[PDB]
Design an enzyme around this catalytic site. Structure first.
Site, mmCIF file in Angstrom:
data_model
loop_
_atom_site.group_PDB
_atom_site.id
_atom_site.type_symbol
_atom_site.label_atom_id
_atom_site.label_comp_id
_atom_site.label_asym_id
_atom_site.label_seq_id
_atom_site.Cartn_x
_atom_site.Cartn_y
_atom_site.Cartn_z
ATOM 1 C CG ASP A 1 33.032 50.994 40.023
ATOM 2 O OD1 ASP A 1 32.228 50.226 39.885
ATOM 3 O OD2 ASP A 1 32.594 51.881 39.962
ATOM 4 C CD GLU B 1 39.931 56.396 45.377
ATOM 5 O OE1 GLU B 1 39.708 58.210 45.093
ATOM 6 O OE2 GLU B 1 39.498 56.365 46.146
#
Ligand SMILES: CCCCCCCC/C=C\CCCCCCCC(=O)OC[C@H](O)CO
Ligand SMILES: CCCCC1CCN(CCCN2C(=O)CCc3ccccc32)CC1
Ligand SMILES: CCCCCCCC/C=C/CCCCCCCC(=O)O
Ligand SMILES: CCCCCCCC/C=C/CCCCCCCC(=O)O
Ligand SMILES: CCCCCCCC/C=C/CCCCCCCC(=O)O
Ligand SMILES: CCCCCCCC/C=C/CCCCCCCC(=O)O
Ligand SMILES: CCCCCCCC/C=C/CCCCCCCC(=O)O
Ligand SMILES: CCCCCCCC/C=C/CCCCCCCC(=O)O
Ligand SMILES: CCCCCCCC/C=C\CCCCCCCC(=O)O
Ligand SMILES: CCCCCCCC/C=C\CCCCCCCC(=O)O
Length: 446
Positions: free
Chosen positions: A219, A210
């Site tokens: 995000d 990630e």
């Protein structure tokens, strides 16, 4: 006892008391002056330092007088009161060691549910109960056994506990204060080390797959995030994001955090993900049937596409539960998931196929200051208290095999736990070592 023997004992025991009182005051003041050391687990360290200060200032010095004089000269009341204080303080030290072990056990195994209960208020309560239980266990029996039995059989000039007649009664107390607490703390440490090993491996897996960000970012949905995909707020403000981050950490971070602080937030996210999986009817039977390595692969999948996403792989999940890993690998690779992130997906798939960390090159478990200090204080307890507890064990097999001189040396070795306990914090914890050195240099100048 000759004059040269009396001076030599007074010097060595006096210097030992000075090293014990200094080390435990240094431990207490370090927590007091340095805010970074004002953590819930250090409240128990402070409580242990208090029990060790009593041992150093009172028990060590009154015992030195008893040795040198060759008898107890302060009376029967002073004897019962000194024994009650010595046994209560020694028992309180063991209970604080149990409090340290249990707190670190629940904070590593359950970092989400227990951290809502892990407050200074609850720590202060457990500390107080440990001191009160120690008092009620020893002090009534020591002071009132003579009244129950009908005579004080401890002679004038002698000082010992009357209720500990047969060595088998003493063995019961040794089982209660040393043998059972040691077995429990060793079992606890074993589970703590195992949990840490597994959690660090998941942390390293998600760091590669990630990515780890030490500063506030946005995000895919535009929400303020930090670490490994840790959502801070859905509010379109940076100040609101900094406020949520400062609340979760406990310091003025100002958008920037450390790898250890990111690992703490990550472990809270792991527990929330694992809680979801076990509550999910499609994911619970596969998770229970998988090993620690393949469980991490499933969590990785949950972190990327969510609960509903992973649950959509109906046939793949059933083949993983059937232990048909080569066949499960086929179905998982023929997905939109593989097409979007082929490198991350192939690494996850290989992990499900082999059940080893071959797709990633993993480092050994880095033992943090907390884990290191725990084994040090536990090994210090075993080291110092073993000679006296073995002498109690010997006494049960043969009546007077243990001579008076050996009981005295066993008692002195036992007291040495109070001396080396602050040394363990200095050796394992950098923040303690620097504060100790700062307080000592300030006392010398002036
Ligand atoms: C036949 C002789 C009887 C054997 C004795 C059995 C008593 C069990 C005690 C401790 C278990 C260790 C688990 C620690 C958690 C309990 C904390 C506690 O309250 O134990 C007080 C103990 O005496 C502080 O040394
Ligand atoms: C809770 C588990 C048991 C922990 C043990 C209990 C025994 N003590 C040594 C007691 C030594 N001592 C004497 O022998 C005579 C009187 C006296 C007065 C003041 C201080 C000490 C003594 C070490 C730890
Ligand atoms: C006196 C200074 C302290 C020295 C450090 C401790 C080292 C261990 C000492 C052991 C020697 C004690 C045994 C002496 C024999 C006499 C026994 C007796 O008959 O009572
Ligand atoms: C013989 C003297 C030995 C004692 C020295 C130790 C110093 C005393 C300690 C003081 C504690 C500092 C006060 C902070 C209170 C925190 C309580 C809280 O959790 O809110
Ligand atoms: C004979 C006198 C000794 C009294 C024994 C009782 C000991 C109780 C222990 C003290 C409570 C611990 C408080 C924690 C310190 C708070 C530090 C801080 O966060 O500032
Ligand atoms: C639970 C009250 C025990 C009395 C306090 C005396 C301190 C010694 C005991 C240590 C246990 C503390 C751990 C917190 C409680 C969790 C219950 C458990 O799982 O055992
Ligand atoms: C270990 C100390 C033993 C105390 C003996 C006293 C016996 C009398 C009984 C009364 C206890 C009731 C008090 C309960 C505490 C209040 C509830 C709480 O807030 O925790
Ligand atoms: C925090 C407290 C740390 C404890 C300190 C103990 C240090 C031990 C090391 C010292 C070296 C002495 C031991 C040498 C081994 C002798 C072996 C032999 O008998 O031949
Ligand atoms: C039950 C609670 C525990 C009580 C702890 C208190 C212990 C203190 C008593 C012992 C030390 C005696 C003080 C020295 C004075 C001696 C004078 C003399 O009588 O000759
Ligand atoms: C004169 C007696 C010597 C001192 C003996 C100490 C043992 C007494 C135990 C009971 C008192 C309760 C301990 C204090 C708890 C407050 C600390 C806290 O809760 O953080």
């Amino acid at each position: 006892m000759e004059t040269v023997e009396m001076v030599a004992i007074a010097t060595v025991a006096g210097l030992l008391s000075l090293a014990t009182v200094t080390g435990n005051i240094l431990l207490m003041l370090s927590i007091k002056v340095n805010r970074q050391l004002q953590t819930v687990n250090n409240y128990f360290a402070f409580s242990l330092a208090c029990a060790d200060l009593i041992i150093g200032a009172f028990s060590m010095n009154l015992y030195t007088v008893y040795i040198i004089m060759g008898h107890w000269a302060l009376g029967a009341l002073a004897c019962d009161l000194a024994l009650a204080l010595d046994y209560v303080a020694s028992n309180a030290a063991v209970m604080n060691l149990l409090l340290i072990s249990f707190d670190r056990y629940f904070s590593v195994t359950r970092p989400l549910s227990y951290r809502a209960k892990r407050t200074p208020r609850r720590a202060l309560l457990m500390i107080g109960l440990a001191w009160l239980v120690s008092f009620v266990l020893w002090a009534p029996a020591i002071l009132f056994w003579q009244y129950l039995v009908g005579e004080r059989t401890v002679l004038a000039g002698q000082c010992y506990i009357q209720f500990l007649s047969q060595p088998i009664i003493t063995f019961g107390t040794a089982m209660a204060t040393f043998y059972l607490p040691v077995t429990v703390m060793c079992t606890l440490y074993w589970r703590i080390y195992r949990e840490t090993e597994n959690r660090a491996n998941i942390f390293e897996m998600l760091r590669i797959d990630e990515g780890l960000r030490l500063k506030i970012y946005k995000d895919t949905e535009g929400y303020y995030t930090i670490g490994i995909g840790h959502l801070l707020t859905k509010s379109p403000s940076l100040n609101a994001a900094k406020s949520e981050l400062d609340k979760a950490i406990g310091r003025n971070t100002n958008g920037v955090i450390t790898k250890d602080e990111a690992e703490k937030l990550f472990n809270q996210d792991v527990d929330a993900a694992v809680r979801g999986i076990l509550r999910n009817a499609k994911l619970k039977p596969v998770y229970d049937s998988l090993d620690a390595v393949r469980r991490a692969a499933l969590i990785n999948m949950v972190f990327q596409m969510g609960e509903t996403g992973v649950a959509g792989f109906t046939n793949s999940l059933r083949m993983l539960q059937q232990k048909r890993w080569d066949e499960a690998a086929v179905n998982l690779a023929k997905s939109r998931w593989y097409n979007q992130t082929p490198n991350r997906a192939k690494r996850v798939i290989t992990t499900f196929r082999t059940g080893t960390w071959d797709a990633y090159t993993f480092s050994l478990v880095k033992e943090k200051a907390a884990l290191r200090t725990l084994s040090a204080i536990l090994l210090a307890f075993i080291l110092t208290w073993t000679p006296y507890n073995i002498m109690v064990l010997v006494s049960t097999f043969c009546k007077d095999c243990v001579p008076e001189t050996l009981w005295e040396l066993g008692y002195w070795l036992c007291y040495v736990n109070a001396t080396i306990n602050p040394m363990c914090y200095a050796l394992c914890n950098k923040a303690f070592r620097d504060t100790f050195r700062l307080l000592l240099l300030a006392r010398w100048d002036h």
